[PDB]
Design a protein around this ligand. Structure first.
Ligand code: NDG
Ligand code: CL
Ligand code: CL
Ligand code: CL
Ligand code: CL
Ligand code: NA
Length: 129
């Protein structure tokens, strides 16, 4: 599923991402924009053999199991395919654990390089949130 901008912000708010760990809703929408272009089916292979999955491009090296990342962890206790569904519950729950482990939203390369220090509020502007 390819979310609309305001559609994704509502779903992120309903699951409790707004101001989670201090990051306003515009940060999460901006991150999803530049990580997956709002596509829940997005995948990308990293050079070390791991794969990023879903709306927030969650890495199989630590957070999910895909059966083909030797020596990796499954800290969110889910199959990586669960991160590709049209329901973003699995992605949001796993993102809450990722963003809680000390480094905040810097675990998302696209957020650090393309959202951090910008007007992230613009990504939820006009939305009937
Ligand atoms: C939180 C998370 O898993 N972020 C990933 C990161 O692992 C990886 O370096 C990158 C590769 O494109 O995409 C995402 O930022
Ligand atoms: Cl915001
Ligand atoms: Cl594996
Ligand atoms: Cl949803
Ligand atoms: Cl932080
Ligand atoms: Na894994």
């Amino acid at each position: 599923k390819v979310f609309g901008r305001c559609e994704l912000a509502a779903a992120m708010k309903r699951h409790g991402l707004d101001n989670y760990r201090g990051y306003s809703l515009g940060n999460w929408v901006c991150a999803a924009k530049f990580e997956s272009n709002f596509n829940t089916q997005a995948t990308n292979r990293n050079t070390d053999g791991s794969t990023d999955y879903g709306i927030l491009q969650i890495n199989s090296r630590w957070w999910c199991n895909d059966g083909r990342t030797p020596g990796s962890r499954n800290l969110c206790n889910i199959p990586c395919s669960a991160l590709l569904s049209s329901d973003i519950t699995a992605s949001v729950n796993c993102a809450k654990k990722i963003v809680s482990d000390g480094n905040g939203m810097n675990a998302w390369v696209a957020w650090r390089n393309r959202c951090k220090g910008t007007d992230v509020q613009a990504w939820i502007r006009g939305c009937r949130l």
